[PDB]
């Protein structure tokens, strides 16, 4: 075989993912990332229809928790949760909502960083 072990590359890639998550949680992005630090509080916000339209809520805090608990089998799985988070926002809010603009700015950060993970994501 030789070369690098697949389990090692996956771990390296998940480490890059952790670093991307850390980047997204930095104070630098606070102006447009804060709405995604925690789960959306439908109750406290009066969004009585949030869990109706959004079947799988997601947020940076939860993704951070799953990463810390070694729950992602690979980078694609991590990416899916990040995109789910943005998808939820685009689906629940009106296209012109201020939070949508913030999501897209934060997604600009994510996509540009994720894509620069050395080589291409392994399964």
């Amino acid at each position: 075989q030789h070369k690098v072990l697949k389990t090692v590359k996956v771990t390296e890639q998940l480490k890059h993912c952790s670093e991307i998550l850390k980047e997204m949680l930095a104070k630098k992005h606070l102006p447009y990332a804060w709405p995604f630090y925690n789960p959306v509080d439908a109750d406290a916000l009066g969004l009585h229809n949030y869990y109706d339209v959004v079947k799988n809520p997601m947020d940076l805090g939860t993704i951070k928790g799953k990463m810390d608990n070694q729950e992602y089998k690979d980078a694609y799985e991590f990416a899916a949760d990040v995109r789910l988070m943005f998808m939820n926002c685009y689906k629940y809010n009106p296209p012109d909502h201020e939070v949508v603009a913030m999501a897209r700015t934060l997604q600009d950060v994510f996509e540009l960083h994720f894509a620069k993970i050395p080589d291409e994501p392994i399964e």
Binding site: L45, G46, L47, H48, N93, H97, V99
Partner: peptide, 7 residues
């Protein structure tokens, strides 16, 4: 319809 209000 409800709408989220960011602060």
């Amino acid at each position: 319809a409800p709408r989220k209000q960011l602060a």
